[PDB]
């Protein structure tokens, strides 16, 4: 349905316009790294798939 | 209820010939939402004089200005 595809990359940084409902108050030393992994792989997975599909 | 004694002051119980019973008489005494200002003609308004005194100060010579005063408005 309409999930707002056009706002996906609109954000200034890599971590916004991403629905992140799996989270906590305190993020540990490696949970933070996990967060920064998740976000950039969320951008990279979705970009590389959209490259592959159309190519 | 439908009692003869509804909505009356105990002095007025004697007058049976005009019972105050009914729903709207309950609304005009406890003055409720159609009657919130009850009697719309109540004392202290007069249509006949509009609370102004009818006295003629208009007298030609200023000497006898108060000549017509105490001219009765009714039998008194």
């Amino acid at each position: 349905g309409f999930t707002m595809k056009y706002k996906k990359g609109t954000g200034l940084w890599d971590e916004d316009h991403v629905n992140d409902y799996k989270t906590n108050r305190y993020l540990s030393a490696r949970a933070t790294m996990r967060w920064y992994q998740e976000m950039e792989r969320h951008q990279t997975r979705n970009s590389l798939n959209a490259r592959r599909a159309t190519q | 209820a439908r009692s003869p004694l509804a909505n009356k002051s105990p002095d007025e119980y004697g007058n049976t010939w005009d019972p105050r019973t009914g729903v709207e008489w309950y609304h005009r005494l406890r003055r409720r939402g159609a009657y919130r200002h009850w009697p719309w003609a109540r004392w202290n308004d007069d249509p006949v004089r509009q609370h102004q005194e009818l006295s003629c100060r208009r007298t030609f010579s200023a000497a006898v200005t108060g000549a017509n005063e105490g001219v009765p408005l009714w039998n008194y």
Partner: protein, 111 residues
């Protein structure tokens, strides 16, 4: 810009009352709201902590996180006592308080 619901702030998970809301998160079906409460006369454990919600930033070994009381795992040495000092796990010798001359004196717990 309705202000965020305070009942849902995470500090409170009541046990399914009559009153509530669609957004009030009550607990699981068949789980009591306080963990040490297996009965109503159940005591609070003394030095045993159960970390809840966020990952504990310092996990003492005798405490509980996603765990049970597994006593060999929880305390390696029963004689030894574990406490937090200067943001580290620091491990002292366990003492018992025993009245001597009318003050209370510390004796080595094990022996």
């Amino acid at each position: 810009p309705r202000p965020a619901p305070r009942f849902a702030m995470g500090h409170m998970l009541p046990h399914r009352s009559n009153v509530g809301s669609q957004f009030l998160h009550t607990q699981r079906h068949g789980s009591r709201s306080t963990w040490y409460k297996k009965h109503y006369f159940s005591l609070r454990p003394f030095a045993i902590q159960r970390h809840h919600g966020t990952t504990p930033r310092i996990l003492l070994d005798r405490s509980l996180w996603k765990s049970l009381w597994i006593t060999k795992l929880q305390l390696p040495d029963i004689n030894r006592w574990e406490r937090v000092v200067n943001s580290r796990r620091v491990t002292e010798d366990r003492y018992a308080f025993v009245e001597e001359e009318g003050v209370m004196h510390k004796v080595n717990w094990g022996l």
